[PDB]
Amino acid sequence: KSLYTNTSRKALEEVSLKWIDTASKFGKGRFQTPAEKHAFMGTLKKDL
Amino acid sequence: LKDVVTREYTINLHKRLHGVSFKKRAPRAVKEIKKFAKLHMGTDDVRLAPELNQAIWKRGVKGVEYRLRLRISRKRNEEEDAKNPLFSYVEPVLVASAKGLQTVVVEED
Protein backbone atom coordinates (compact mmCIF):
# COMPACT_ATOMS: atom_id res chain seq x y z
CA LYS A 1 0.00 0.00 0.00
CA SER A 2 1.40 3.41 -0.93
CA LEU A 3 2.84 5.78 1.58
CA TYR A 4 0.95 8.82 0.47
CA THR A 5 -2.34 9.40 -1.25
CA ASN A 6 -1.95 10.57 -4.81
CA THR A 7 -4.23 13.12 -6.41
CA SER A 8 -2.51 12.42 -9.69
CA ARG A 9 -5.50 12.39 -12.08
CA LYS A 10 -3.15 10.03 -13.89
CA ALA A 11 -3.93 8.05 -10.72
CA LEU A 12 -7.65 8.03 -9.71
CA GLU A 13 -8.37 7.36 -13.42
CA GLU A 14 -10.76 4.45 -13.21
CA VAL A 15 -9.47 2.23 -15.98
CA SER A 16 -11.34 -0.55 -17.72
CA LEU A 17 -9.66 -3.23 -19.78
CA LYS A 18 -10.89 -4.00 -23.26
CA TRP A 19 -8.70 -6.92 -24.32
CA ILE A 20 -5.97 -9.10 -22.78
CA ASP A 21 -3.34 -10.79 -24.91
CA THR A 22 -3.56 -14.54 -24.50
CA ALA A 23 -1.33 -15.36 -27.46
CA SER A 24 1.75 -17.44 -26.71
CA LYS A 25 4.95 -15.67 -25.73
CA PHE A 26 7.13 -18.56 -26.88
CA GLY A 27 7.19 -17.11 -30.39
CA LYS A 28 5.38 -14.69 -32.65
CA GLY A 29 1.98 -15.76 -31.48
CA ARG A 30 -1.13 -15.23 -33.60
CA PHE A 31 -3.79 -17.12 -31.71
CA GLN A 32 -5.16 -16.44 -28.25
CA THR A 33 -7.41 -19.50 -27.96
CA PRO A 34 -6.92 -22.97 -29.43
CA ALA A 35 -10.44 -22.23 -30.39
CA GLU A 36 -9.23 -19.32 -32.49
CA LYS A 37 -6.42 -21.50 -33.82
CA HIS A 38 -8.48 -24.49 -34.98
CA ALA A 39 -11.08 -22.06 -36.36
CA PHE A 40 -8.63 -20.41 -38.75
CA MET A 41 -6.21 -23.06 -40.02
CA GLY A 42 -8.70 -25.86 -40.41
CA THR A 43 -8.05 -29.50 -39.59
CA LEU A 44 -4.77 -31.33 -39.63
CA LYS A 45 -3.13 -34.67 -40.22
CA LYS A 46 -3.65 -35.75 -36.62
CA ASP A 47 -7.03 -34.53 -35.32
CA LEU A 48 -10.50 -35.98 -36.09
CA LEU B 1 23.01 -54.69 -3.51
CA LYS B 2 23.80 -55.67 -7.07
CA ASP B 3 21.06 -56.89 -9.41
CA VAL B 4 22.55 -57.84 -12.81
CA VAL B 5 20.34 -55.97 -15.31
CA THR B 6 20.13 -55.05 -18.96
CA ARG B 7 17.75 -52.53 -20.48
CA GLU B 8 17.55 -50.53 -23.65
CA TYR B 9 17.38 -46.75 -23.39
CA THR B 10 17.22 -43.77 -25.68
CA ILE B 11 19.02 -40.61 -24.63
CA ASN B 12 18.60 -37.07 -25.75
CA LEU B 13 22.04 -35.87 -26.63
CA HIS B 14 20.82 -32.74 -28.37
CA LYS B 15 19.70 -31.23 -25.03
CA ARG B 16 22.87 -32.32 -23.27
CA LEU B 17 24.88 -31.19 -26.28
CA HIS B 18 23.19 -27.87 -27.10
CA GLY B 19 25.67 -25.00 -26.96
CA VAL B 20 28.79 -27.16 -26.77
CA SER B 21 31.77 -26.11 -28.91
CA PHE B 22 32.04 -28.11 -32.11
CA LYS B 23 35.47 -29.69 -31.91
CA LYS B 24 34.33 -30.90 -28.48
CA ARG B 25 30.74 -31.99 -29.12
CA ALA B 26 31.35 -35.64 -30.07
CA PRO B 27 33.88 -36.07 -27.29
CA ARG B 28 31.38 -34.41 -24.89
CA ALA B 29 28.87 -36.80 -26.39
CA VAL B 30 30.91 -39.83 -25.37
CA LYS B 31 31.43 -38.53 -21.87
CA GLU B 32 27.81 -37.44 -21.50
CA ILE B 33 26.81 -41.06 -22.07
CA LYS B 34 29.13 -42.38 -19.38
CA LYS B 35 27.38 -39.82 -17.22
CA PHE B 36 24.05 -41.12 -18.46
CA ALA B 37 25.03 -44.62 -17.39
CA LYS B 38 25.84 -43.86 -13.76
CA LEU B 39 22.62 -41.89 -13.45
CA HIS B 40 20.70 -45.08 -14.11
CA MET B 41 22.86 -48.05 -13.02
CA GLY B 42 24.75 -46.48 -10.12
CA THR B 43 28.16 -47.55 -11.41
CA ASP B 44 31.35 -45.49 -11.61
CA ASP B 45 32.83 -48.11 -13.89
CA VAL B 46 31.31 -47.66 -17.40
CA ARG B 47 32.46 -49.24 -20.64
CA LEU B 48 31.51 -48.40 -24.24
CA ALA B 49 31.54 -50.97 -26.98
CA PRO B 50 33.73 -49.81 -29.91
CA GLU B 51 30.65 -49.94 -32.13
CA LEU B 52 28.87 -47.54 -29.81
CA ASN B 53 31.89 -45.36 -30.38
CA GLN B 54 31.47 -45.55 -34.14
CA ALA B 55 27.74 -45.15 -33.70
CA ILE B 56 28.70 -41.86 -32.09
CA TRP B 57 31.46 -40.65 -34.35
CA LYS B 58 29.36 -41.61 -37.34
CA ARG B 59 29.16 -38.12 -38.67
CA GLY B 60 32.46 -36.41 -37.87
CA VAL B 61 33.00 -34.31 -34.77
CA LYS B 62 30.26 -31.72 -34.84
CA GLY B 63 27.73 -34.16 -36.22
CA VAL B 64 26.34 -36.20 -33.34
CA GLU B 65 22.72 -37.26 -33.88
CA TYR B 66 20.09 -35.90 -31.56
CA ARG B 67 18.97 -39.24 -30.15
CA LEU B 68 20.72 -42.58 -29.53
CA ARG B 69 19.26 -45.98 -28.66
CA LEU B 70 21.51 -47.73 -26.18
CA ARG B 71 21.86 -51.09 -24.49
CA ILE B 72 23.15 -50.60 -20.98
CA SER B 73 24.19 -53.93 -19.59
CA ARG B 74 25.23 -53.93 -15.95
CA LYS B 75 27.52 -56.81 -15.08
CA ARG B 76 29.75 -57.94 -12.20
CA ASN B 77 33.43 -57.00 -12.29
CA GLU B 78 36.10 -59.70 -12.37
CA GLU B 79 39.82 -60.03 -11.46
CA GLU B 80 42.22 -57.82 -9.37
CA ASP B 81 39.18 -56.47 -7.42
CA ALA B 82 38.47 -52.91 -8.54
CA LYS B 83 36.75 -50.61 -6.07
CA ASN B 84 33.16 -51.36 -7.15
CA PRO B 85 31.89 -54.90 -7.72
CA LEU B 86 30.07 -53.94 -10.90
CA PHE B 87 30.32 -52.10 -14.21
CA SER B 88 28.15 -50.96 -17.10
CA TYR B 89 28.56 -51.79 -20.76
CA VAL B 90 26.95 -49.68 -23.42
CA GLU B 91 26.15 -51.16 -26.80
CA PRO B 92 24.32 -49.48 -29.69
CA VAL B 93 21.03 -51.10 -30.58
CA LEU B 94 20.06 -51.54 -34.21
CA VAL B 95 16.87 -49.59 -34.51
CA ALA B 96 15.54 -47.95 -37.63
CA SER B 97 14.50 -44.82 -35.77
CA ALA B 98 15.34 -44.04 -32.14
CA LYS B 99 12.36 -41.68 -32.12
CA GLY B 100 9.54 -42.52 -29.73
CA LEU B 101 11.00 -45.73 -28.30
CA GLN B 102 10.70 -45.59 -24.53
CA THR B 103 12.70 -47.67 -22.08
CA VAL B 104 12.17 -51.41 -22.23
CA VAL B 105 13.71 -53.91 -19.82
CA VAL B 106 15.58 -56.78 -21.41
CA GLU B 107 14.97 -60.29 -20.10
CA GLU B 108 18.13 -62.18 -20.99
CA ASP B 109 19.12 -65.69 -22.11
Binding site: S16, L17, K18, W19, I20, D21, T22, K25 | -
Partner: protein
Protein backbone atom coordinates in the same frame (compact mmCIF):
# COMPACT_ATOMS: atom_id res chain seq x y z
CA UNK C 1 4.52 -14.81 -13.59
CA UNK C 2 5.44 -12.54 -16.46
CA UNK C 3 3.93 -9.76 -18.46
CA UNK C 4 1.46 -9.45 -21.33
CA UNK C 5 -0.32 -6.68 -23.17
CA UNK C 6 -3.61 -4.89 -22.62
CA UNK C 7 -5.86 -2.64 -24.65
CA UNK C 8 -7.99 -0.03 -22.95
CA UNK C 9 -9.65 3.28 -23.63
CA UNK C 10 -8.19 6.43 -22.12
CA UNK C 11 -9.65 9.13 -19.86
CA UNK C 12 -7.05 11.95 -19.84
CA UNK C 13 -9.34 14.92 -20.54
CA UNK C 14 -6.90 17.07 -22.43
CA UNK C 15 -4.57 14.67 -24.21
CA UNK C 16 -4.50 13.82 -27.90
CA UNK C 17 -5.43 10.35 -26.77
CA UNK C 18 -8.42 11.32 -24.64
CA UNK C 19 -11.29 8.89 -25.21
CA UNK C 20 -9.07 6.80 -27.51
CA UNK C 21 -7.65 3.27 -27.41
CA UNK C 22 -4.07 2.78 -26.25
CA UNK C 23 -2.04 -0.39 -25.76
CA UNK C 24 -0.08 -0.79 -22.53
CA UNK C 25 2.23 -3.54 -21.21
CA UNK C 26 1.31 -5.18 -17.86
CA UNK C 27 3.11 -7.65 -15.59
CA UNK C 28 1.13 -10.28 -13.70
CA UNK C 29 2.05 -11.54 -10.21
CA UNK C 30 0.83 -14.92 -8.97
CA UNK C 31 -0.93 -14.20 -5.70
CA UNK C 32 -2.64 -17.18 -4.01
CA UNK C 33 -4.10 -16.41 -0.55
CA UNK C 34 -1.43 -15.98 2.06
CA UNK C 35 -1.95 -17.67 5.43
CA UNK C 36 -1.60 -15.96 8.82
CA UNK C 37 0.43 -17.97 11.35
CA UNK C 38 1.99 -15.60 13.85
CA UNK C 39 1.84 -12.12 15.37
CA UNK C 40 4.44 -9.57 16.53
CA UNK C 41 4.23 -6.41 18.58
CA UNK C 42 6.97 -3.85 18.55
CA UNK C 43 7.87 -1.05 20.89
CA UNK C 44 9.21 2.44 20.84
CA UNK C 45 12.62 2.61 22.55
CA UNK C 46 14.97 5.62 22.71
CA UNK C 47 17.21 3.36 20.64
CA UNK C 48 14.56 2.51 18.04
Amino acid sequence: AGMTTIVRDLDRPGSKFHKREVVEAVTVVDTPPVVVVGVVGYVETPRG
